[PDB]
Design a protein around this ligand. Structure first.
Ligand code: ZN
Ligand code: ZN
Ligand code: ZN
Ligand code: ZN
Lengths: 95, 51, 47, 115
């Protein structure tokens, strides 16, 4: 079972950062509003922190994901890495 | 140099994003068709029960 | 400066590439799950 | 029906182009040899041109595509494919369009890294 919330939020966030329009005085606050929700979508249901080694149910669409330390889902892993690199690029450039 | 290259990478990146999105929509379609076929299958099973 | 941005964008591009690949393989798996329930449903209709 | 070959080849080509090592005497040839098949997967069957308004068969998974302005015309490969006969059968394919644009931007990058 793939994660819809996570991928959707990654698309929104990446689209927001990479299309940052220098001229829209409202863009930065938008990115700032969307970023914590994207962060929430990839967090561990035990830790609270960002998923270390994601594991997901296959029978439902629970949207509930836990660490291996706490059925491995590759999409969730790639998305965690995506979050990390997007954060890295956000830190590197100024919006 | 690096401006045209990075500005090129940004565009190909956004395009890749659009692809990921369209694939997600396809996956959702597959989920709905599978679940529909599954309930339909389960109700078609009850046909054996009525012998 | 812009070379750090480029070196970063390359990496995120590769990451998205991996994501696209996984989604492809999953779409394929679900295609198999459909074809199976389709053949199964058909043989059950025949029965 | 989505383009399976086209996405596979896009992934391969993009991975090879993005991990490009000029210190590797083998990478350049690998890219040059994988690359014509990737353009082929996004070529039109009437034109030979890059798929303009991609219309992709739902009829089968033979994966032969044509432009929207290329409906009803004879396909190029001979012997002709048996599955793509029905021209009333294909629909517009969004994934293909995205992939065409991907190819074009990828080439735009390749010409820059070569020169
Ligand atoms: Zn945890
Ligand atoms: Zn749950
Ligand atoms: Zn054509
Ligand atoms: Zn064909």
């Amino acid at each position: 079972m793939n994660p819809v919330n996570a991928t959707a939020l990654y698309i929104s966030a990446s689209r927001l950062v990479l299309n940052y329009d220098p001229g829209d005085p409202k863009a930065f606050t938008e990115i700032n509003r969307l970023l914590p929700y994207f962060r929430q979508s990839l967090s561990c249901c035990v830790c609270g922190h960002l998923l270390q080694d994601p594991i997901a149910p296959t029978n439902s669409t629970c949207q509930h994901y836990v660490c291996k330390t706490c059925e491995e889902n590759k999409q969730l892993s790639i998305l965690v890495n995506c979050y990390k690199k997007l954060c890295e690029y956000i830190t590197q450039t100024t919006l | 140099g690096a401006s045209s290259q990075a500005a090129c990478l940004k565009q190909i990146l956004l395009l890749q994003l659009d692809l990921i999105e369209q694939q997600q929509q396809q996956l959702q379609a597959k989920e709905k068709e599978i679940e529909e076929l599954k309930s339909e299958r389960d109700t078609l099973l009850a046909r054996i029960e009525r012998m």
